[PDB]
Design a protein around this ligand. Sequence first.
Ligand SMILES: CCn1c(-c2cc(N3CCN(C)CC3)cnc2[C@H](C)OC)c2c3cc(ccc31)-c1csc(n1)C[C@H](NC(=O)[C@H]1C[C@@H]1C)C(=O)N1CCC[C@H](N1)C(=O)OCC(C)(C)C2
Ligand SMILES: Nc1nc2c(ncn2[C@@H]2O[C@H](COP(=O)(O)OP(=O)(O)NP(=O)(O)O)[C@@H](O)[C@H]2O)c(=O)[nH]1
Ligand SMILES: [Mg+2]
Lengths: 163, 169
Amino acid sequence: NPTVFFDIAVDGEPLGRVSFELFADKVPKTAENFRALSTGEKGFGYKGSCFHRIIPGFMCQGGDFTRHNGTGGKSIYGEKFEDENFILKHTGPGILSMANAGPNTNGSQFFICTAKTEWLDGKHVVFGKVKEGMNIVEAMERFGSRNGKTSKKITIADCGQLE
Amino acid sequence: MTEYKLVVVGAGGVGKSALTIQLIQNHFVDEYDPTIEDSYRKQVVIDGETCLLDILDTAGREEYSAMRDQYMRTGEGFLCVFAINNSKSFADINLYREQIKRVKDSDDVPMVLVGNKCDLPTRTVDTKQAHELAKSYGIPFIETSAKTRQGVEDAFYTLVREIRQYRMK
Ligand SMILES: CCn1c(-c2cc(N3CCN(C)CC3)cnc2[C@H](C)OC)c2c3cc(ccc31)-c1csc(n1)C[C@H](NC(=O)[C@H]1C[C@@H]1C)C(=O)N1CCC[C@H](N1)C(=O)OCC(C)(C)C2
Ligand SMILES: Nc1nc2c(ncn2[C@@H]2O[C@H](COP(=O)(O)OP(=O)(O)NP(=O)(O)O)[C@@H](O)[C@H]2O)c(=O)[nH]1
Ligand SMILES: [Mg+2]
């Protein structure tokens, strides 16, 4: 399974690095999308994008690199792609899962759980987990709010694939 | 200055946010941007009196219907929105009205029925059906387009008038 990293910044100041294991062995198409978006190798991707919705107690959501407002993003396969499978569940903090607009509408937006969110099981494709830097994700929560609006700009200052 | 707590409810995608953003920000964005929840404040003049509107824009998500009760308790009047091209959203109106009635323990709750998206040519809910539903509730019915602004101020101001009449008693 490949590993990718995000270097997180808060209003342009470094916070730290989060790395993720991507479950290519169970969800290869979905893992590959996130991997390629993390490297930028298709000519577009996560670098420079923000976490537009942070709700403490639930999750941190980001991945809109096209409109930068929470409505955009695109996959490496087209605007949207189908739900690969729902094998993996939202079991607790650190789970990495796809945002969507309903069935079969995966793009680039994703979320990192900060708690168990079992009512999302079967609706969002889980495809990875935080490997290192969960402390960083925990630290991001204070910049969110009940409706998710952030009080500082939380950005992916850099991202890529690790050896 | 009198404050009015308005809550905009209805099925997902009917245009609750588009209506609210038109009122607050005077523009329309043609994007899929589902709401979590948002609160807005706006001062207006209605029938010659300064009113302060506190507007809660809510998510239309059946999977979170239990989360509605808390804001139904606090809200003073409800804009109940359906889309004129979505017959399911028109049926869903009754679920919201029943929930408001049960949470607030009253048949007298200020409400306005709003049929949105009246700029679209292909209508599936006829005005006769909507008028008869509003009449059966004893509440006003207003047709709107958040896209063109048609009826938008009328919908919110009519709801304030319903609250104002309720408070007179
Ligand atoms: C009722 C209030 N509410 C609530 C809610 C729910 C609870 N509980 C439910 C579970 N029980 C057991 C306990 C109580 C408590 N407190 C609140 C909030 C804090 O009260 C304000 C949620 C929510 C989600 C949406 C709308 C309203 C909503 C929504 C609106 S778009 C959406 N979901 C799905 C979202 N697609 C997009 O962004 C699309 C546009 C892009 C392309 C999406 O893929 N993801 C990823 C997964 C998480 C989801 N976003 C999201 O943000 O979930 C927020 C969360 C707080 C987890 C749930
Ligand atoms: N043609 C037209 N489209 C409209 C109108 N009002 C909203 N829309 C469109 O319908 C879609 C849903 O609108 P939106 O206001 O986000 O709906 P909502 O009721 O707030 N949805 P949610 O409950 O998920 O927050 C958007 O694409 C929006 O541009 C309208 O009056 N006319
Ligand atoms: Mg909305």
